[PDB]
Structures are given as structure tokens and as C-alpha cells.
Write an enzyme that holds these catalytic residues in place. Structure first.
Site, PDB file in Angstrom:
ATOM      1  N   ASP A   1     -21.179  14.631   2.165  1.00 43.11           N
ATOM      2  CA  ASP A   1     -21.898  15.689   2.870  1.00 43.11           C
ATOM      3  C   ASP A   1     -23.351  15.291   3.073  1.00 43.11           C
ATOM      4  OD1 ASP A   1     -22.184  18.069   4.274  1.00 43.11           O
ATOM      5  OD2 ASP A   1     -22.283  19.323   2.460  1.00 43.11           O
TER       6      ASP A   1
ATOM      7  N   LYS B   1     -28.182  27.425  -9.306  1.00 42.83           N
ATOM      8  CA  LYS B   1     -27.173  27.378  -8.248  1.00 42.83           C
ATOM      9  C   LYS B   1     -25.990  28.247  -8.665  1.00 42.83           C
ATOM     10  CE  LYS B   1     -24.377  24.182  -5.417  1.00 42.83           C
ATOM     11  NZ  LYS B   1     -24.097  22.698  -5.176  1.00 42.83           N
TER      12      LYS B   1
HETATM   13  N1  JGB Z   1     -32.041  23.996  -2.341  1.00 45.00           N
HETATM   14  C1  JGB Z   1     -32.388  23.389  -3.224  1.00 45.00           C
HETATM   15  C2  JGB Z   1     -32.870  22.591  -4.412  1.00 45.00           C
HETATM   16  C3  JGB Z   1     -32.102  22.031  -5.306  1.00 45.00           C
HETATM   17  C4  JGB Z   1     -30.589  21.958  -5.363  1.00 45.00           C
HETATM   18  C5  JGB Z   1     -30.066  21.183  -6.380  1.00 45.00           C
HETATM   19  C6  JGB Z   1     -28.670  21.001  -6.496  1.00 45.00           C
HETATM   20  C7  JGB Z   1     -27.829  21.588  -5.570  1.00 45.00           C
HETATM   21  O1  JGB Z   1     -26.399  21.396  -5.706  1.00 45.00           O
HETATM   22  C8  JGB Z   1     -28.342  22.364  -4.541  1.00 45.00           C
HETATM   23  O2  JGB Z   1     -27.522  22.949  -3.647  1.00 45.00           O
HETATM   24  C9  JGB Z   1     -29.743  22.544  -4.428  1.00 45.00           C
HETATM   25  C10 JGB Z   1     -34.378  22.392  -4.610  1.00 45.00           C
HETATM   26  N2  JGB Z   1     -35.359  22.929  -3.590  1.00 45.00           N
HETATM   27  O3  JGB Z   1     -34.762  21.748  -5.554  1.00 45.00           O
END
Ligand code: JGB
Length: 325
Positions: free
Chosen positions: A150, A62
Site C-alpha cells: 500500500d 490507531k
Molecule cells: N497518520 C498518522 C501517523 C502515524 C501512523 C502510524 C502507524 C499507522 O499504521 C498509521 O496509520 C498512522 C503520524 N502522523 O505519525
């Protein structure tokens, strides 16, 4: 207004637990993780499927878009506090590019099916089960003193084959402190509680339960999003056109809030519309008396009247999910 449960969690913990401005980040190794493909994006982040070069196991990278350092420590501090919680995404590592010091958060990877494709697929039981798994995450983070702020399908990752759920993107989450006035410019518009739409700033964990109710209505009535406002004034009109304005008026009077005249005229006056008026041939198999009773107890104007996450989990709607457990 003050939370009916878990109001004191942060009062009793040492200040370092909720004092996220004072966190000092121990930075990992930027080259341990390599981007494989883009997976998602938002106003504050881009998200990629990554690979951990040491063990060749998948991960999520991320990459945070430029924001104030405060928001960064807030998300990190909250993820560290919740790590190990049921169905909370696990923060694995924190790294930065050397030249630009752009930070990246490393997480476990969920092989998600996007909700726009997944939800029409789910059976009635599947809906009960995944909402139950989400409730576990909310009860835990509430019990640890944190509001997610959220909740929406975009932030619930589901590997439907493994039946695994994770509550993700804690970048708007916040510590609950009894009496604190918070920013109402949180959540995503279709999932904002009435308290956000009438500028009631001393909200609490119960905001997440409205958002959950909106998600849930969307799933059982196959109307996504369920409340479809164009802007924040319209979103309250759309709510009032369902719950009725009589209930809105007692809410406003109980917490002593007057609407802006432009907003007040826009809302007008509407009688309450019973939940059965949203049933049709398409969603009929998902809209049972218990689902309706459960939804009714989430989507209340009065945030103090909504179910807590712990109560919601015991609702008879979930009895068959609990029995399987
Ligand atoms: N998209 C996605 C995914 C994980 C994710 C994990 C922490 C976050 O803060 C975030 O925005 C996304 C995923 N497919 O595992």
C-alpha cells in the site's frame, strides 16, 4: 513468477516468524494513552494524536475498525518483525478497550505535513532525499520477507523540519512466499501495479516498486495522482495510454494472461508516450535526465524488469544524497 531477490527469506526462518495466525497478543494498559485530537482515518482505522500519560510524550493511537482477527494479528506480527528497521514506524504498545475489546495500536508520533501541502514545497534535492529515505524502508522490509502492498504518499509520514520519514499503515502488508497467489484487491487504485490490474496473482516485492514509481512520477511531474483511473478497468487504460499497448501485449504474452474482452476493448491500442511529454514550465526544474532514467526503470509492465529497492538506491539520481550520507 517469483521474486528475483529475497525469495527465500521466509523459507529459512522458523515458522513462528511468518505464522501470524499463531501470535498471542500481550495487551498493554488502555489508560496509558489518551486521545488528544483526530489526525487521520481510513477504511480500517481511525488515527489520533495521543499522549503517553507516564512520560507525557506524544504518540499515535490507531483504533482499528471491526475486521477479521486475522488481519489484526497480521499487521501486529509484521510491525513487530520490522521494529528497528530504517524508517519503519515503531509499534510501541497494543491495548484494548475492556468493554468492547476494540484494539488500538500505539506508535511513535510523527509531526507530519500532509503530502498535498508538502510536496509542492519540496526542492529537487528534497525529492531525491525523501524518496531515498523511503527506499531504505522498502529494501529493509523486503529483506525481512514482507511486501507493504500500500505504498502511497498518504502512508509516508514526513516531519520536514527534522527531515524524518516513516513508512506507515502496514494493515495490508503481507509475507512473501515464493509461488503464493495473493489477493489483487490491495494497494490504492492509483498505485496498483499492472499485475494487480490484469489479475496476475503471484506478484512479489516488485509491486511496491511500481507504487513507488507512481508516487515519484507524481512528485517530479506535479501530476497527482499520475495515473488517474476512475475504477480498476480505467486505471489500466490510463497506464496503457502512457506506456503504450505494444509493451502491454508482450507482458501479457510472457506471463500467459488474456484480458477480459470488455477490458481489452477498453484498452484499445496506444503508442508509448515519452516521459518528456509530461514536462512543463511548472515541473521543468524537477525533470532531469537522471530522474527520467530512474522513473523509466520503475514503471515497467514486467514486474521482473523493475529495479529492486537495493538497486534503486544506487542509481546515479541519488548520488548527491549518498555523498551527504
Ligand atoms: N497518520 C498518522 C501517523 C502515524 C501512523 C502510524 C502507524 C499507522 O499504521 C498509521 O496509520 C498512522 C503520524 N502522523 O505519525
Amino acid at each position: 513468477s517469483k521474486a528475483r531477490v529475497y525469495a527465500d527469506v521466509n523459507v529459512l526462518r522458523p515458522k513462528e516468524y511468518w505464522d501470524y495466525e499463531a501470535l498471542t497478543v500481550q495487551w498493554g494498559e488502555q489508560d496509558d494513552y489518551e486521545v488528544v485530537r483526530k489526525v487521520g482515518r481510513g477504511k480500517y482505522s481511525e488515527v489520533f494524536e495521543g499522549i503517553n500519560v507516564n512520560n507525557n510524550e506524544k504518540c499515535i493511537i490507531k483504533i482499528l475498525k471491526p475486521v477479521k482477527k486475522k488481519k489484526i494479528k497480521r499487521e501486529i506480527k509484521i510491525l513487530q518483525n520490522l521494529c528497528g528497521g530504517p524508517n519503519i514506524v515503531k509499534l510501541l504498545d497494543i491495548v484494548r478497550d475492556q468493554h468492547s475489546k476494540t484494539p488500538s495500536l500505539i506508535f511513535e508520533y510523527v509531526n507530519n505535513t500532509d503530502f498535498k501541502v508538502l510536496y509542492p514545497t519540496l526542492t529537487d534535492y528534497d525529492i531525491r532525499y525523501y524518496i531515498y529515505e523511503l527506499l531504505k524502508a522498502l529494501d529493509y522490509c523486503h529483506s525481512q520477507g514482507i511486501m507493504h502492498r500500500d505504498v502511497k504518499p498518504h502512508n509516508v509520514m514526513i516531519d520536514h523540519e527534522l527531515r524524518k520519514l516513516r513508512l506507515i499503515d502496514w494493515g495490508l502488508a503481507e509475507f512473501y512466499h515464493p509461488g503464493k497467489e495473493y489477493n489483487v484487491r490491495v494497494a490504492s487504485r492509483y498505485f496498483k501495479g499492472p499485475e494487480l490490474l490484469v489479475d496476475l496473482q503471484d506478484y512479489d516485492y516488485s509491486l511496491d516498486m511500481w507504487s513507488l514509481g507512481c508516487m515519484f512520477a507524481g512528485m517530479i511531474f506535479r501530476k497527482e495522482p499520475f495515473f488517474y483511473g476512475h475504477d480498476n478497468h480505467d486505471q489500466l487504460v490510463k497506464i496503457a495510454k502512457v506506456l503504450g499497448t505494444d509493451g502491454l501485449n508482450v507482458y501479457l504474452n510472457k506471463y500467459r494472461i488474456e484480458l477480459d474482452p470488455q477490458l481489452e476493448a477498453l484498452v484499445g491500442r496506444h503508442s508509448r508516450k515519452p516521459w518528456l511529454k509530461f514536462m512543463n514550465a511548472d515541473n521543468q526544474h524537477l525533470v532531469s535526465p537522471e530522474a527520467i532514467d530512474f522513473l523509466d526503470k520503475l514503471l515497467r509492465y514486467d514486474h521482473q524488469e523493475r529495479l529492486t529497492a537495493l538497486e534503486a538506491m544506487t542509481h546515479p539520481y541519488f548520488q548527491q544524497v549518498r555523498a551527504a550520507e
